Design a binder for this molecule. Structure first.
Ligand SMILES: CC(=O)N[C@H]1[C@@H](O[C@H]2[C@@H](O)[C@@H](CO)O[C@H](O)[C@@H]2O[C@@H]2O[C@@H](C)[C@@H](O)[C@@H](O)[C@@H]2O)O[C@H](CO)[C@H](O)[C@@H]1O
Ligand SMILES: CC(=O)N[C@H]1[C@@H](O[C@H]2[C@@H](O)[C@@H](CO)O[C@H](O)[C@@H]2O[C@@H]2O[C@@H](C)[C@@H](O)[C@@H](O)[C@@H]2O)O[C@H](CO)[C@H](O)[C@@H]1O
Lengths: 303, 303
């Protein structure tokens, strides 16, 4: 059975790990030989494994509740707890965090060094919406204990000169990274522990690399005393749903990979890629490929 | 030529007219017998007609430039021009506004009662990104001439108590509607005319209705003397790209429509819709259908 791939350029696809920013390049790096992400992982057989979705934009915004306190030492870091509608009762066999929430990495207990940014507003006391939405810095855990600093839990802390209102609900739309956060710290993701079904960490076969659908993430700061010192950066994914949702019509034959041709201009230059059934695609071998081109189904090869 | 529709529920699809908020219902109304929208227009043959796109979230954010001026009387309304990076030659045969920008209606010669809201922030001095991004009431045109009030051009006005910086670029993320905006004023789209290729206004055959893929839009206001007075509303579309993207394997036979079965409640209940070649769906001759079901291909019928 042959596979028909529509001629959709990579520049017209969604970025699962960072919507609202179009794809700019295809990035291959020789220093990145693993992937422990939770968003953007798909499988031919199992569908959307891990904590991903087929509607990244719909589930990108979340809500949380203040807990009337602050972390020890730093009085500006108000503690708060994420709100999860998909798992009302805290059943250990289901993921704690809401579906589709971000997982960008920040550091092994990193404070002054770097943080992340978001939009945040209190409830309107009317049930209709929110008020006074502005930028703030946030992070997972409390950056004090090793057991829950990078643990992908439902407890976070947010910087605010004033004090949060206890028992009220706030909205979160995370967009930006602050402090000293480079590309490497964002590439890695916080660890996860428990008994729920989370996506494992893959590794490429010896002698191959991985495409990363790289994008560009700009900055958003605040001109005020102790404001938000943030910087521009880049963000990467593994696979977008648009490319892989086509294969469901005719699944991969047992123990077989696909050979793909990427055509840039006319027929002058053609690149050869290999797609596996576990989600990632490889390239034999470090540079950047332009995003204007179309994919082609060549043949089936053995892994 | 058979059509095989994957069992994706409508609750896991994107809303072209308003990303960042999932679809909650399927809405049919007897007072809406036309559609002059510019976002969400798709066809079997021409692909994305009008100003539509297959990546709604990528092109949702825009930018504009201030012009150092104000409308007569209401100085608070500073004029500005949208920035276009696809027709950088102001060619009349190409669309003026950028792809994927908002087209919510707000009324005719009437801005002492209603307005639209957007996240606006000024540029920094390093190219890193934007800064001090906050909510701002905005609208099309200048509310003075009949030919430039609701005309879908690249000139807008934004309310700001302070003075805008001339020649600086600002970012726009439209999210919310304020004042006295109800659902009827948002359903109608601003009129467009000229020489460029725009999408026409369709009408259903007599004896049928339209399914609208409706979604809920919350409110975001500001606590200040001349602050934002936003309201909660609903936003409807015509068709999401996920449903039409599959039909491209085998196009519809000439002069023929399709019958689709909507199966909910474990099959117990099943609805019957008719899908045409232009993009819209028709239901026999007013309520809300739940969003827990999957579409099923029944057969081909004559229109
Ligand atoms: C989260 C918080 O409350 N402060 C950030 C802030 O850094 C602070 C910090 O550097 C202290 C001393 O270390 O001095 C200032 O408060 C500083 O604020 C930042 O630096 C000044 C110069 C301004 O740029 C100000 O706008 C800015 O907020 O950011 C650093 C990043 O290194 C840390 O993240 C602190 O937690
Ligand atoms: C765009 C602008 O500057 N003002 C809006 C505002 O209405 C004004 C208006 O009603 C005038 C007199 O008509 O009186 C106030 O300024 C009023 O402001 C609004 O009402 C007060 C109580 C606050 O809520 C304020 O934040 C709010 O702006 O909204 C109306 C819609 O009714 C128009 O949009 C005006 O242009």
């Amino acid at each position: 059975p042959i596979w028909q791939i529509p001629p959709t350029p990579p520049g017209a696809m969604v970025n699962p790990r960072s919507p609202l920013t179009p794809v700019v390049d295809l990035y291959i790096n020789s220093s990145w030989t693993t992937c422990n992400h939770q968003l953007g992982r798909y499988t031919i057989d199992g569908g959307a494994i891990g904590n991903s979705t087929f509607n990244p934009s719909g589930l990108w915004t979340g809500t949380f509740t203040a807990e009337s306190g602050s972390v020890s030492g730093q009085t500006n870091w108000r503690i708060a707890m994420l709100d999860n509608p998909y798992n009302p009762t805290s059943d250990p066999t289901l993921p704690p965090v809401p579906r589709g929430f971000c997982d960008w990495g920040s550091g092994v207990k990193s404070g002054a060094r770097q943080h992340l940014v978001c939009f945040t507003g209190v409830e309107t006391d009317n049930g209709e919406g929110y008020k006074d939405v502005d930028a703030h810095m946030w992070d997972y855990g409390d950056d004090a204990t090793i057991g829950l600093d990078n643990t992908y839990q439902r407890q976070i802390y947010i910087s605010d000169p004033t004090a949060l209102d206890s028992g009220k609900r706030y909205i979160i739309i995370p967009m930006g990274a602050s402090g000293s956060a480079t590309d490497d710290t964002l590439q890695i993701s916080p660890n996860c522990y428990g008994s729920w079904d989370y996506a494992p960490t893959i590794a490429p076969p010896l002698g191959e690399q991985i495409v990363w659908f790289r994008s560009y993430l700009p900055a958003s700061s605040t001109s005020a005393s102790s404001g938000v010192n943030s910087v521009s950066a880049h963000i990467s994914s593994l696979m977008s749903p648009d490319l892989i949702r086509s294969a469901y019509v005719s699944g991969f034959p047992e123990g077989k990979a696909a050979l793909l041709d990427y055509v840039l201009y006319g027929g002058s230059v053609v690149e050869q890629f290999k797609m596996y059934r576990e989600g990632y695609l490889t390239a034999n071998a470090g540079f950047i490929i332009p995003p204007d081109g179309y994919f082609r189904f060549n043949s089936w090869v053995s892994p």
